[PDB]
Structures are given as structure tokens and as C-alpha cells.
Amino acid sequence: YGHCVTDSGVVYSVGMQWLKTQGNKQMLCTCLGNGVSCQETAVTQTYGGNSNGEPCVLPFTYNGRTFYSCTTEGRQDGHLWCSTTSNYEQDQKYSFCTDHTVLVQTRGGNSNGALCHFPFLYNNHNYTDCTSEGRRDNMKWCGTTQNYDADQKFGFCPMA
Ligand SMILES: *[C@@H]1O[C@H](CO)[C@@H](O)[C@H](O)[C@H]1NC(C)=O
């Protein structure tokens, strides 16, 4: 009942994102009722810029390099900027992203390689870090859904 299965046998409860592949690249897929939200894993909340509250259009080259996602090249406000036009040198459109979004990829336990959602609720407590609630061992974990305790699905965070 519910959840989504991709890759070959990887179940991902609703409101659950995860990394995948759609050819020669990786695509971001998430369980959402009965339609896995599969979409590139690039670009994020785009504000202001030469796009005026619009999405991006990667890849986008600039200065002589081919950026495949937001970048801080040129900007000094802290956030990253992205081009909103396949041909940056053409449209010259762009947009300032927000903290280059955030997508965690936990694994082991239950969230079989599930793109942990940060932040993540816990027992009704806004959490923004691989919490070890009930751990006590060298290792942290987070919630695969905005409502962990409400989703009953956790996963270990990267070790690198
Ligand atoms: C957790 O944070 C979100 C927005 O960050 C808010 O809508 C939600 O109500 C918060 N949950 C609790 C239990 O405070």
C-alpha cells in the first residue's frame, strides 16, 4: 500500500526522494502517491536574477566553462547564481539559487538508499541534521521524509 519501487526492487514510501538514472545521467526520483516524481537533480529555488522568478536551463556555460548547476562564480553575496537559458551567451538570463538546496542520500536499515530530506521532522521536532535519536554509536541518521516519526523511515548519513 503506497510507496514506490524503482531500480529493480528499491521501495521508497511516499514523500520519499532518491537518486536514480535515466540513460547516461542520474535523475532524482521521489515517491508521491502513485507517481514517482522523477526529475533532474540540479537547480534549486531560483529567486531574482535575470530570470525574474523563473527556473534554470542547464547546462549553462560562463566565462569559458560549462556549468551543469548553480555556481558562485562572480557573485559574492554568498548564494549561488544559475543561468536560465541553454545559451547563456544568448539570453544571458540567470537566477540566484538558495544555499544550493540540500539533498541527503542515506542508506541501510529501511531507507534503502533514500534521498534523506533535510530538514526532517522528528516526534514533532524540526530537525536539520543526521540525528542519532536512540543511537549511542559512532554513526548518525536522519529522516527520509519531512515527517520521520510520522513516516517511520530513517537512514544512515554519509561517512566520507
Ligand atoms: C517544522 O518546520 C516546518 C517549516 O520549516 C513547519 O511548517 C512545521 O510546522 C514544523 N513542525 C513543527 C512540529 O513545529
Curated annotation (Swiss-Prot):
Mostly heterodimers or multimers of alternatively spliced variants, connected by 2 disulfide bonds near the carboxyl ends; to a lesser extent homodimers. Interacts with FBLN1, AMBP, TNR, LGALS3BP and COL13A1. Interacts with FBLN7. Interacts with COMP. Interacts (via type III repeats 9-14) with TNFAIP6 (via CUB domain); this interaction enhances fibronectin fibril assembly. TNFAIP6 may act as a bridging molecule between FN1 and THBS1. Interacts with TNR; the interaction inhibits cell adhesion and neurite outgrowth. Interacts with FST3 and MYOC. Interacts with SVEP1. It is found in: Secreted, Extracellular space, Extracellular matrix; Secreted. The gene is FN1. Expressed in the inner limiting membrane and around blood vessels in the retina (at protein level). Plasma FN (soluble dimeric form) is secreted by hepatocytes. Cellular FN (dimeric or cross-linked multimeric forms), made by fibroblasts, epithelial and other cell types, is deposited as fibrils in the extracellular matrix. Ugl-Y1, Ugl-Y2 and Ugl-Y3 are found in urine. Fibronectins bind cell surfaces and various compounds including collagen, fibrin, heparin, DNA, and actin. Fibronectins are involved in cell adhesion, cell motility, opsonization, wound healing, and maintenance of cell shape. Involved in osteoblast compaction through the fibronectin fibrillogenesis cell-mediated matrix assembly process, essential for osteoblast mineralization. Participates in the regulation of type I collagen deposition by osteoblasts. Acts as a ligand for the LILRB4 receptor, inhibiting FCGR1A/CD64-mediated monocyte activation. Secreted by contracting muscle, induces liver autophagy, a degradative pathway for nutrient mobilization and damage removal, and systemic insulin sensitization via hepatic ITGA5:ITGB1 integrin receptor signaling. It is linked to Glomerulopathy with fibronectin deposits 2: Genetically heterogeneous autosomal dominant disorder characterized clinically by proteinuria, microscopic hematuria, and hypertension that leads to end-stage renal failure in the second to fifth decade of life. Spondylometaphyseal dysplasia, corner fracture type: An autosomal dominant form of spondylometaphyseal dysplasia, a group of short stature disorders distinguished by abnormalities in the vertebrae and the metaphyses of the tubular bones. SMDCF is characterized by flake-like, triangular, or curvilinear ossification centers at the edges of irregular metaphyses that simulate fractures. These corner fractures involve the distal tibia, the ulnar aspect of the distal radius, the proximal humerus, and the proximal femur. It comes from Homo sapiens (Human). This is Fibronectin. Sulfated. Residues 2-41 form the Fibronectin type-I domain. Disulfide bonds join C4-C31, C29-C38, C56-C82, C70-C97, C116-C142, C130-C157. Glycans are attached at N126. Residues 51-99, 111-159 form the Fibronectin type-II domain.
